[PDB]
Each structure stands twice: as C-alpha cells, then as structure tokens.
Amino acid sequence: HHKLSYSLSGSWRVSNGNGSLELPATVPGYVHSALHQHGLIQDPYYRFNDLNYRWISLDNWTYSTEFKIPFNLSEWQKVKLIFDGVDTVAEILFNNVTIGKTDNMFTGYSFDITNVVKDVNSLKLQFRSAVQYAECQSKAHTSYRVPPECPPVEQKGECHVNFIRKAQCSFSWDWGPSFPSQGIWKDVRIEAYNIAHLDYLTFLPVYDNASQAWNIEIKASFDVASSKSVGGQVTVAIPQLKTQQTNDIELQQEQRIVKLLVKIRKDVAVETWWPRGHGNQTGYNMTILFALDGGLKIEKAAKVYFRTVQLIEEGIKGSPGLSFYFKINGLPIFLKGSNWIPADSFQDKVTSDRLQLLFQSVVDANMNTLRVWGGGIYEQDEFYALCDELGIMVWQDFMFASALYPTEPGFLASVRKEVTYQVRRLKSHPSIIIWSGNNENEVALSVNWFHVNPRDMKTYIDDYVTLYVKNIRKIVLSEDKSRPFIASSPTNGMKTMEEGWISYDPYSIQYGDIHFYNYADDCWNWKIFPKARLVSEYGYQSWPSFSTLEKVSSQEDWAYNSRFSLHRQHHEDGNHQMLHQVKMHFKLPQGTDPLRTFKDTIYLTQVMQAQCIKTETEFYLRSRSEIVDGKGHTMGALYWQLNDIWQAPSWASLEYGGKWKMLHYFARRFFAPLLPVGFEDEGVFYVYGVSDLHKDHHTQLTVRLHHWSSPKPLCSLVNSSIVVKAGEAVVLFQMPVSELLKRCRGCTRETCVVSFYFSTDKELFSPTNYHFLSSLKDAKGLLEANITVNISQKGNVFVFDLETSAVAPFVWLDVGSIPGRFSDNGFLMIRKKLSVLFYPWKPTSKSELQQAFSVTSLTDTY
Ligand SMILES: *[C@@H]1O[C@H](CO[C@@H]2O[C@@H](C)[C@@H](O)[C@@H](O)[C@@H]2O)[C@@H](O[C@@H]2O[C@H](CO)[C@@H](O)[C@H](O)[C@H]2NC(C)=O)[C@H](O)[C@H]1NC(C)=O
Ligand SMILES: *[C@@H]1O[C@H](CO)[C@@H](O[C@@H]2O[C@H](CO)[C@@H](O)[C@H](O)[C@H]2NC(C)=O)[C@H](O)[C@H]1NC(C)=O
Ligand SMILES: *[C@@H]1O[C@H](CO[C@@H]2O[C@@H](C)[C@@H](O)[C@@H](O)[C@@H]2O)[C@@H](O)[C@H](O)[C@H]1NC(C)=O
Ligand SMILES: *[C@@H]1O[C@H](CO)[C@@H](O)[C@H](O)[C@H]1NC(C)=O
Ligand SMILES: *[C@@H]1O[C@H](CO)[C@@H](O)[C@H](O)[C@H]1NC(C)=O
Ligand SMILES: *[C@@H]1O[C@H](CO)[C@@H](O)[C@H](O)[C@H]1NC(C)=O
Ligand SMILES: [Ca+2]
C-alpha cells in the first residue's frame, strides 16, 4: 500500500547542442533512431552515412520531458527517479536542479528527488558526445598512454573507446561501424514509497555436496524511509517443491540488507536444468513476500532453475598440462555454438520479435552455447530469459575487449558499480556457465600487441591485475561461487593464475582455451588447426547476400572492389584474403556481366566460409576423446561469429536482418548429436564417429563414391559393427586412397567424390556428409548442372521440389529479402531429385517466392 511505481518511457523531446534541432524522441531510444524516425536523416546504414553523419555523434544532445506526477506529494515520504540504462555521459537536471551525473552505460542509477519534485516537473538529460568525452579523458590521463589510442584506418572509427564505459565496439570494429550515439537505452521510472524501498533483490541456487541438498541464497537491500527500525517477516514459497519458509527481518539505515538461505527439503525430488539436446530446461516458480510493519507488502516472483556447473582442469594421461571442459550436473558436455555480438548499432531496435527470431535460428543450428563477447553489451533481460528457457549456455564476458584500460580512481569507481550491478542482475540465470574477465587482453600484454616500451610494461601489468583481479574478480567471487571465473579469453586457466595472471603463452593448447585465425594457409588442411582443450573463437570471413547489400547500396556499388565495398570492409585486406582462400580450391568467377560477377563472388566467399569452418569444426569435434602427440581432448567449439551488426563482410553465419548464410546451414549439420566426419592423413581416408548422446549408439556406416557423371555409386562399403560411445569420438573407418579408388573402379581423385552417412531412427538427426578427393577447380567430368524448381505451398510452409541435370555441388537457394530460411541449403546434390522446405518469418505467397527465387550451383560461376 505504501509503494508506487510507474514508467516515464514514452515520447520525449530531443535537441542538439545549439538548439537548432528539436524533434520527438521515443524513450528508450537513441538520437540517431529519433532523427531517422522523424525523417530528418537517411538510414545511417546507407552507403557512406557513417562518414556523413559523424556530426551526430560529435554534438551534445539533450533528452527532455515535462510530466505531471499521478500522485500527491504530501502522501509520500520518499520519491526516487530510477534509470535502468543511460548511454552514457550525462548531467541530469530535475526542475533545473542537477540531481546527478552518469558515466557508465552498463549500470542502473537511482536518484532521490523527494525535495525537488513538484506537481508538474521537467526532466532533462544533457548528454555529452561519447567521442569528445573519450578524447578529453585520454588527455587528462597525462601520466602515461593507454593503448590502443586509435583504431585501424580501415575501420573508419573513433579513438579512445577504452576511456569510456560504453559498448567497446561502438567506435567501430573490424566488422562494425562507428555510430557512437547518445540515448536513454533502458526504462526510466518514478518510484515513491513510505517505510522502505527495495533497491534490489538477487538469489543464487546452489548445491551443497556436503548436505547433498539444494539451497537458495537470497540477498535484498532496502532503502529505509526514516531513522527508525522497520520490522516484519519474509515468506519464500516454491509450491511445486512443497517448499515454504518464513523468517523475521528488521531494517535500519545502517542495517539495510536482508540475507536468507532457503533449504529445499530433501523429501522432494528436484529436476535439474540442462542445455538443449542434453535434458530438460525445467525450472520452478517462486515468490518472495515481504510483509513489513505498517501494511507495506513487497512481493517479487522469479523462476528458479537448479543446475551445477564445474570447469574441470584435471590431468590427462600422456597429455602435458590440464584439461579445460565443462560438467553440467556432473556430465561432461562439448560446447557447441558461436560468439554473440550486438545485433544493432542502436539497442532500441533490437526488439523482442527480432531476438526471439534470432534465438530460433540459434536453436535450429543445433547450438547449445553462446559467448556474450566483451566488446558488446551486457545483454537485455530477454536475451538471458531466452537462454534459460531454450537451454542455451552463456559464456559471459565482462565488457572489456582487445584494449588496455586506465586504473584512474574515477574509472575504477565506475567499473565497480557496473560489475556489481551486472553480477547481481545476472547471477541467477542457469544459462551463464562461466564469468570471463575480458576478451583477449591477457594475450595483448603477454605478446605486447600494442608494442609498449618494455620499460613501462610493469605499469600495464599492474593495471591489468588491478582491474580484472583486484576489482572484477573480487566483486564476482564475493557475489557468486557457483560458477568458474577466468580473467581473460583466451587463457591458460589455473595455469594463468599460477603465473601471476598473465601467462607466458596464453595460446597454449596444453591449457585453457584458445582463439585461432589463419587466412594464409589452406583451410582444408586440418593440420593447421591447434588440437586445443577448447576453442572459444575461430572464423572465416564472407560477404552477406546481395539482397542484404541492396538495401543500403546503389547500382554503381555492386562490384567486389567498388568504393562502397572497400568502405564496408573493416578487416585489413579481407577482400584479398577471402579471394586467396577461394582460389585455394575454387575457380574465380569468369563472366561478362559485372553484376553477375559480383553476386557469384559473394556466393563463393560463403562457399569458402562454409566449407572452411566445416573442416575446422569437425576437426575439433573428432579430437574430444583422443590424445595425439600429447594434444587433444577438445571439449568446445564456439566459432566467430554468430551475427552481424550491419551489412558488411564478416565472420557471421547470420546476416544483418537474420538471413542465413550458407555457413549457418552447414552449422546445423556439423553440430548434430551424431555425426560421421571424414578426412585424410598422408594418403589414408579416415571416418570418425562423433556423439553427443548419453548412451552408446549402434548404427551402420555406409560409404560410397560417385563419378561427377551421374549419381550411381561405383561402390558401397557398409560396416554394420559400428558403436560410438556416449558423448565420444572414435575412428570408425580407415583405408588407403589407392585402395579406396581401386575398390570403386572408374574413380580418380579428380573425378569422384566420397559420401557417407549413418542409418538413424527418425528420432535422431544424423545428416549426410561428404569428402572431396581434390580441389573442385581441378575436378574432371564435372557436368554443368541445370536445376529446375517447382514451388508449392503446404500449410504455413512452402515446398521446393528440385531436379538437377548433374551431381551439383553447393546448390544454393535464395529468395532475396523474403524473411525466412530453408530446411537445408548449400548441400552437395548427388541425387537427381530433392525436396526442401522454406519457413517464412512473415506472411508470404508462392507468387512472391517464385518472383524472387534463384538457384545456384558451383558450375554457374565460371
Ligand atoms: C535447362 O533445363 C530446361 C528444362 O529442361 C527440362 O527438364 C529436364 C530435367 C529434362 O526433363 C528435360 O527433358 C527438359 O527439357 C531446358 O528448357 C527446355 O528446353 C527444351 C528445348 O531444349 C524445350 O523443349 C522445353 O520446353 C524447355 N523446358 C522448360 C521448362 O523451359 C533448358 O533448355 C535447359 N538448358 C539450358 C541451357 O538452359
Ligand atoms: C508459473 O508461472 C507462469 C506465469 O508467469 C505460468 O504460466 C502462465 O500460465 C497461464 C495459464 O496456466 C497462462 O495464461 C499465462 O500466459 C502463462 N504465463 C506465462 C508468462 O507463461 C505457469 O503455469 C506457472 N507454473 C505453475 C506450475 O504454476
Ligand atoms: C536554472 O538554475 C540556474 C541556477 O541553478 C544552478 O544551475 C542549474 C543549471 C543547475 O545545475 C542547479 O543545480 C544549479 O544550482 C539559474 O542560473 C538559471 O537561470 C535557471 N534557469 C531557468 C530557466 O530558470
Ligand atoms: C547549429 O549548428 C549547426 C551545425 O551542425 C548549424 O548548421 C546551425 O546553423 C547552428 N544553429 C544555430 C542557431 O547556431
Ligand atoms: C560538447 O560539450 C563539451 C563539454 O561541455 C564541449 O567541450 C564541446 O565543445 C561540446 N561540443 C559541441 C559540438 O557543442
Ligand atoms: C524431461 O521431460 C520429459 C518430458 O518430455 C519428462 O517426461 C521427463 O520425466 C523429464 N526427465 C527428467 C530426467 O526429469
Ligand atoms: Ca590457452
């Protein structure tokens, strides 16, 4: 009865520095999106507007609103103004009184406005340019430089992002633009109360190996209205666990924290939470009721999920060092997923509908893990709710990435609030399986990426320990010991800590995790890849589809090396690197029409990307059970990257807008729970079996060769004594290449293709796989394919019946910007006739699909 809360989200005003511009502005919102919405600017993502609209990011904008409170001041002891998120630096004026300032995008702010609030009020947030602010802070830091000061020229970005607590990629990245905007990016509320006010509540389900029982630690902080002592009770209730518990509490200005420990009666069984493909995502409804002196009731509901996570760094026989793998509820689980980056330059456009769609694509790719990479944001509430409900594990970076950071007291003060706020906000989600202090900054110092003078290295080392160990780690462990903490990615884990927090070689495959990139060598040669304990990053670049590019480009831009394309490419020499890897096994597009060449080159970079990451992922998949030359037991593959922040060449499998690249289709296939993977070593074709299943599985391995001439198997080897143990990888086939060809007369490396598959239940997804005996640019007898398609509707799905004149590799179906994705794409089409489905994301029609449809195969490019 003594509490009142309502949102100030809605229609505000926004105005620029000198007041010339003034327009309506939605909150939550950003200046750029307000200007675009009001028709005052073009789409910022159009062509070169990241350069043309620089002035927006450099001015100082003010968000203003006038409102009439819906309550009587004289009836309330205290009134507060609460911000869930402000981006980033702003002075806050309430009725022309400065009530506070902000400097951190990732922390909530609370301001007492009891003495300044009136019946009619004016609220102004006077933002400061993030770019200008970051530069001034860099200047003030005279005692020494903090690198990197400016980004590479090919990123077309802004300097000194490490000096502002804001999304570190907002000043540009090697796949993202520089639109460092200003805005109120989360909800704003007025909250009045008597007696007490719940500042925050956090909880943590833990398992006591001692008691063999489940508990829930709860912590709540209150702001008490007066100097008197508030009493009351608290009842925590979980009905579906026959659990209920009531305790006495008392609150005072200097004793404002409540701590409870609810024990779950062992009489009842507690179903645990599991990642997708390894169990149920079951949780339990919970309520927390505060009944305080004077009729004040404060209830909070939450969903409780019970699961245990262990980072196991144990010894391995014959493999020097330590393992690095995750046990969920005691079961070792191979991490399968990708790295998540911000889905937009402006967070107000990452709607619930976009997110749910993106998580459907993550699910349909047979992923169970996402890394929230530390150059993005601490993600919005619904991200982690979706992870919990769908069973996606989260590798959670803190928002520090590929940079050194100051330890000036004001900055550290800012960081402490942020980390404290976010850990309390996030620690109750079962999806989060590990805390990670930063991205790649242990490497940056160990290798001296920024070429610091070895005379000043000690300064930066101490700054590193100060930030990630003495502040971030200390805060995390003081809140949460249910999860492992690493200081950086990649790291050597316990070995890094032993070595003083900056390892001698953080890229060691004998400890911790690694990131691995390589653009020079043949991606088909799996020997280039490290047989590491866990691969948290690895990627190849490709261009997004023409449909995605068309929306932010014009006719004259549609060439691989046009001014526009080189502008969007933010990775040093990425266009050449991508072609270099294409040439490795494919013919470059030869054609007369430049637009056709443009589209065909895109297709080939997505072909190169998909096949490269397929080869690389499968290598990690097969290395999970074996040791070879003292290396192995790979227990995770998270490729860089899942998604795009805008239309540009990147490592993503999901183009900006959600459209699947060919990589994503390959991802759905190589992340299956049961998979045969083929490769060669010194002239011997091998086939391992890979299992994520919990029971040993017995199946039948068929192997076949096919001449490019027609889909007739020149042989059919069928071992039916196949057993893959639970969650393991094991060699199931082995033969010389000469012996393999002779047993299939009429086959050359340059004329035949290998194919293999298991025979599965209809309740188990184990797709076809294949292997190429030579570069396709050298394939002989490759008949020119001529594929015919008949489109039809069946319920909410559309059916695509195909027919090919020849064995067509990398058949690619494309319906432009029609929102949706196919049941399968980019596949090797041995058969003559196949059928795939199309899943629309908005209502479409067979006519629309026919008009936009196009099919491509490898031979169409030369
Ligand atoms: C590429 O294919 C089309 C369609 O070929 C048909 O489908 C095949 C699977 C097979 O059933 C063939 O017998 C069919 O012809 C070709 O278009 C056809 O061209 C012929 C003349 O050669 C004509 O009589 C048909 O009416 C056409 N059919 C359609 C649907 O248009 C086409 O010529 C093929 N070749 C090239 C270079 O495009
Ligand atoms: C746990 O709480 C949720 C509500 O948050 C319950 O789900 C609701 O179920 C009703 C009908 O059963 C629906 O009308 C609502 O739309 C649901 N809400 C949501 C948010 O999904 C759920 O049934 C509860 N479980 C138990 C065992 O009580
Ligand atoms: C607003 O108030 C000014 C004096 O108050 C001081 O400045 C403002 C901007 C706040 O920061 C407040 O905390 C300070 O104490 C006046 O100089 C100014 O004329 C006033 N403006 C109007 C329109 O009334
Ligand atoms: C405000 O600054 C802009 C610069 O972007 C300028 O075009 C405009 O004329 C200025 N208006 C006033 C009133 O000074
Ligand atoms: C923005 O504000 C800062 C600090 O108040 C000031 O130094 C800078 O000149 C302002 N920029 C513009 C474009 O008005
Ligand atoms: C998981 O959920 C299924 C429903 O599909 C249920 O029947 C089963 O009992 C659950 N398994 C466990 C181990 O709780
Ligand atoms: Ca390592």
Please outline the helices and strands.
Layout lengths: L2 E5 L2 E6 L6 E6 L1 E2 H7 L11 H4 L1 H5 L3 E7 L9 E6 L5 E6 L2 E7 L5 E4 L7 E8 L2 H11 L30 E3 L2 E3 L4 E2 L3 E6 L2 E13 L4 E12 L5 E9 L4 E9 L5 E7 L20 E9 L4 E8 L4 E4 L12 E4 L2 E3 L1 E6 L11 H13 L4 E4 L8 H10 L2 E5 L11 H18 L5 E5 L4 H8 L8 H23 L5 E2 L7 H5 L15 E3 L18 E4 L7 H5 L12 H6 L5 H10 L10 H29 L4 E2 L2 E2 L3 E4 L22 H9 L3 E8 L2 E8 L5 E11 L9 E8 L4 E8 H6 L9 E6 L11 E4 L15 E7 L2 E7 L4 E7 L5 E3 L4 E3 L3 E8 L5 H7 L1 E3 L6
Parallel strand pairs: 25-26, 25-34, 26-27, 27-28, 28-29, 30-31
Antiparallel strand pairs: 1-14, 2-3, 2-5, 4-13, 5-10, 6-9, 6-14, 7-8, 7-10, 11-12, 15-16, 16-19, 17-18, 17-20, 20-21, 22-23, 23-24, 32-33, 35-36, 36-39, 37-38, 37-40, 40-41, 42-43, 43-47, 44-46, 44-48, 45-47
Helix pairs in contact: 5-6, 7-9, 13-14, 14-15
The structure holds a molecule of 3 linked components (NAG-NAG-FUC), a molecule of 2 linked components (NAG-NAG), a molecule of 2 linked components (NAG-FUC), 2-acetamido-2-deoxy-beta-D-glucopyranose (3 copies) and calcium ion (CA).
Catalytic activity: Hydrolysis of terminal, non-reducing beta-D-mannose residues in beta-D-mannosides
Function: Exoglycosidase that cleaves the single beta-linked mannose residue from the non-reducing end of all N-linked glycoprotein oligosaccharides.
Family: Belongs to the glycosyl hydrolase 2 family.
